[PDB]
Every structure is written in C-alpha cells, then in structure tokens.
Design a protein around this ligand. Structure first.
Ligand SMILES: Cc1cc2nc3c(=O)[nH]c(=O)nc-3n(C[C@H](O)[C@H](O)[C@H](O)COP(=O)(O)OP(=O)(O)OC[C@H]3O[C@@H](n4cnc5c(N)ncnc54)[C@H](O)[C@@H]3O)c2cc1C
Lengths: 278, 287
C-alpha cells in the first residue's frame, strides 16, 4: 500500500522502522529474522538505509516477500542521473510503491549527477506521477538559517512530496517548532517525527557533529555522568525516547519513524513501555 | 501598530497581557499604575477583558500610556447596531487591534442565547469589521486547542475555526491551556486544514484551587493529572498553590519559546504577581 493512503486511512498512529546495511552475511540473516519478529508490532513500513545499489533492490524484494511494506531509500550522491533513474526503475519494477528521495551525505555532486533531493522527487513524478508515494527528509534543527532551510523544504515539497520523515531529534520542542515554520509556510503534508533512542555514549559525537541533533541539558548530564556504564546509557536513552513519543502521540502526530540499530531492541522497548505492542 | 504588522516583522516572540475590569476606582488607578510600570517591558499589546462605554475609555487610557491596546469586542447580549456603535467608538479612538469574540452567557448562566437582533458567531463580527473597516484594523479571534465546551467534536470545532479565519482573521489567541501537547496538536490539526495565520498561545498560571472549576467547565481546559494531584493536595495553602501554578507556567512557556511560538499571551488577574513571577524566572524581567 502507498504510504500516502496508509496515512489518510487514519487507523491510529503509524509506526515505521529504519534499519542499517548489515555488516556481514550472518548479520543480514539476523536483520531479516528481526523483520519477521517485527510483524508483532504491525509496522506500517520498513526500510534499510541506502549506501549497495543492487543489494538494496534485493532487500526491497526480500521485505516484500515477508509481507512487509518496503520504503526504498534512494540518494543522488556519487551517481549519474542515468544510474539513479536505473535504480529507480529497478525498485518500481520489483513492486516498490514507496520511495524516500534523499541527497546523500557528501556536498559535491557526481559530475553527471543531481545536486538536490528535489531533483530526484521531480524525476520520480515525471516518470511515475501518482503511481508511487514519495517522501523526503525534514531537518527540524536545520543545518545557513532555519528560515533558508524551510524555503529549501518548501521547494522539495512542491517538487511532489506526499510526506516527510524527520532527522532524529531528542528535544520535541525543535520538532514542534519545525512543524510551526511549515504551517506558516503553507505546508500541509504529513511530517512524521524520526526517533533514535541513545543506546551508547559513542553515538553522541555522530548525533551532534554529523546529524546536527542537539542533546537537551537534562539528557546530556544523565548520559555523561553514567558515560562508563553501558546498561545505564541504554536505560537513559529508552526512558528519554518513551517520554518524547508519549508527548508526540498526545500532540496528535500521524506516526513515529524509529531508527533501529539492527541488534538493538531499544525501539521495541519504547513501544512496549508505552503499551503499544498489539 | 497593527498586530498583523508586528507579527510579519518577525523580531522574536510578541509578549502580550490581558487584565480584568477593575472592581472600584482605587483598583482602576492601581491597574493603570501597573500598566505604566509594564511599558518598560515593551509588551507587544495589552488588553482589559470586555460596561461597553468603560471598555472604550480603558482602550483610550492604554493608548495615553504609549501602550498598544487590543480591544475585546463581543456580540453577546447586544444588538447588531449596538455592537457596530461600540466597534466605531474603538476605531475612532485610534484602536487598530480588535479581538472579535462571541462572549460568554451572563453571570451564573451556562447556555448561550443570542440577543434577538444580535450576532450569533464571532465570525459574523469579523465579517462586519472587514466590510466596514477593511485593513484599517487588524482582527484576531479566540482559538480552542481542546475545543469549545459547546462544540460536538474537535473536527467540527476546527471547521468553525477555519470559517472564522476565512471571515478575515489576521491572527488568533488560544484559550488558556495547561498541557502543551494539546496546543501543539491543535496547531497540527490547523496545519492539516491549511490554516497559516499566526496562533498565539494563551497562558494563565493557576493562582487558586477555586479557579479549576472555571477552567475545566467554562474555559474547557483539561488539567494534567500530575498538576491536578498537586493542586488537590495543597487546596488551602495559597502560597504553595501560587508556587505550583507559577512553576507549571514557567515549564509550559519555556517549551513554547523553544518551539519558536510567535508570542505568548498572559491572562493576568489585576492584583496577581503570578505573571511577573513567571517572567522573572524565564529571565524576561529582573528579579
Ligand atoms: C483570547 C480570548 C479572549 C477572550 N476575551 C473575552 C472577553 O473579553 N469577554 C468575554 O465575555 N469573553 C471573552 N472570551 C471568551 C469567549 O468569548 C468565550 O469562550 C465564548 O464562549 C466563545 O467566544 P468565541 O469568539 O470563540 O466564539 P465563536 O467563534 O462564535 O464560537 C462559539 C461556538 O459556535 C460554534 N460555531 C462557530 N461558527 C459556527 C457556525 N457557522 N455554525 C455553527 N456553529 C458555529 C463554535 O464551534 C463554538 O462552539 C475570550 C476568549 C479568548 C480565547
């Protein structure tokens, strides 16, 4: 089912899961076993982050074969326009109905490639129109100004987005604040909050330096005073994500997208502790 | 200054204050001393809740202090012609900012019935103002994040809100709320309905247990379980009820400001130090 339609269907909040490319063959089999277990939570869609162009088409097929609904990540970084159109064709031919159009981390484009995620959105709409559902990344904490960032989002939405999924955040006020900039800019599409519980102290450099997320003071303090206790970090991260999602659901979000480490049960723990395992 | 122009300028959050009709002449002079002391804070605008001749004079006196008045104007218990006459009295006073309200039933009555030659909906007053004054005035209306108590559902309430905006609102101020998620959820419903106008959160710190009945039944605000717990085990200690209410409002407003609201609108009892205490602890006024 197209995510556009799943969102209109209004049958409670949608819970989605994003996993990561497996490290080795046994990790890939453990990832698809974990996907089979995940049917317990009735996930509205599942994805594996895209670098592995041929692997990702086969993963989309494997997810389908499990009776799950794949969201295929497609990036424009380090590919020609022809290369990106080819992977696009391969996904939709395989029965993929849902695409997440991303620029990719490094920015300097491939010399015969696209520069902006909006160009990939426009390509999909040119080739497939409304036969597919297309999402893009939203950045509640931005990167230039938040105002310039929001104009770049508006542009991408207007290229033909059906929905957006946020970058991970730990401070819900930043997500609500992005939704308010979007409303003032006339953006009405569904914007799903993305949540990654802190599972280890090592992650905080990635989160701040790479993903640009901010760590609220009360969370940062608890983490850095327990920084050498892996069990403590995990409990701090799950508790923080439980409180975040509890407030997001009270604020009528249409769903929550969970960034899940392949081996980590944290996202499953968050939904169990909220009483949301069916 | 028209509030739609203050909001467009985008210079950080607007802070506004709404006070209550004074009870006697000493109270009236003490209220206007308070407003003279507030001008140091550069409030975006100030109002007294809506005696129709008195309300026009109060708007004049606020202007006399160099403050920007928001004239509250209701349709309850007045003919269309009486509402039009009061409206004209505000505009001719140089009042540029109107808040078009239906108004409550009279004191001790709980069922709204329109005056037989009167308006029924605030949207009718918004349309009157736009037909008669156009862009000479900036017009706001009430929004209800938890729904009007007399609305049948949140989706019907939102439909009615949209109709009021389409009548010619430049902005809205919410009913008071205690649970920020209900405010954020209202903005998300407004966003899904294509409502883009600025919507300013209305905050009233709990200053007494007795107020909770007004808040839940007349105003239609829910009280979160933790706060309700704490209030209903401190009922007869007004020093601590004050402290509970101020600390809850500080935590609300802190989150609203981190969520980049376009401003905060504080409902302030005339003698109450609660708003001042909230501003001090937020670092917006000196201790
Ligand atoms: C910031 C603020 C300031 C206030 N100031 C004052 C004040 O100074 N004096 C005072 O007495 N009160 C004041 N109030 C209270 C307000 O007047 C009451 O809440 C009143 O009950 C409703 O006012 P309103 O303008 O929202 O009404 P309206 O917008 O007319 O709504 C009244 C009801 O009618 C419904 N409705 C609206 N349009 C339609 C339609 N076309 N068909 C059917 N149903 C419809 C609504 O959903 C709602 O249930 C204030 C409230 C706020 C939030």
């Amino acid at each position: 089912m197209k995510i556009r339609d799943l969102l209109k269907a209004r049958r409670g909040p949608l819970f989605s899961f994003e996993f990561f490319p497996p490290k080795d063959p046994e990790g890939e089999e453990a990832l698809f076993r974990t996907l089979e277990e995940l049917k317990a939570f009735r996930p509205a869609f599942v994805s594996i982050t895209y670098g592995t162009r041929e692997r990702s088409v086969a993963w989309a097929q494997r997810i389908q074969s499990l009776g799950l609904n794949p969201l295929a990540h497609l990036t424009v970084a380090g590919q020609s326009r022809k290369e990106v159109a080819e992977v696009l064709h391969r996904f939709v031919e395989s029965g993929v109905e849902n695409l997440l159009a991303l620029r990719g981390d490094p920015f300097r484009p491939h010399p015969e490639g696209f520069r902006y995620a909006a160009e990939l959105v426009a390509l999909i709409r040119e080739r497939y129109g409304d036969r597919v559902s297309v999402g893009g990344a939203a950045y509640p904490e931005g990167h230039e100004s938040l105002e310039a960032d929001l104009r770049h989002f508006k542009a991408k939405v207007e290229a033909g987005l059906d929905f957006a999924i946020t970058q991970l955040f730990f401070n819900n006020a930043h997500y609500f604040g992005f939704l308010e900039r979007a409303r003032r800019a006339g953006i009405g599409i569904p914007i799903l909050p993305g949540i990654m519980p802190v599972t280890s102290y090592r992650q905080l450099r990635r989160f701040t330096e790479v993903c640009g997320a901010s760590i609220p003071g009360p969370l940062l303090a608890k983490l850095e005073r327990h920084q050498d206790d892996p069990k403590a970090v995990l409990e701090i991260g799950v508790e923080h994500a439980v409180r975040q999602v509890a407030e997001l659901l009270e604020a009528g979000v249409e769903g929550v997208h969970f960034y899940t480490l392949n081996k980590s049960p944290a996202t499953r723990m968050v939904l169990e502790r909220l009483g949301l395992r069916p």
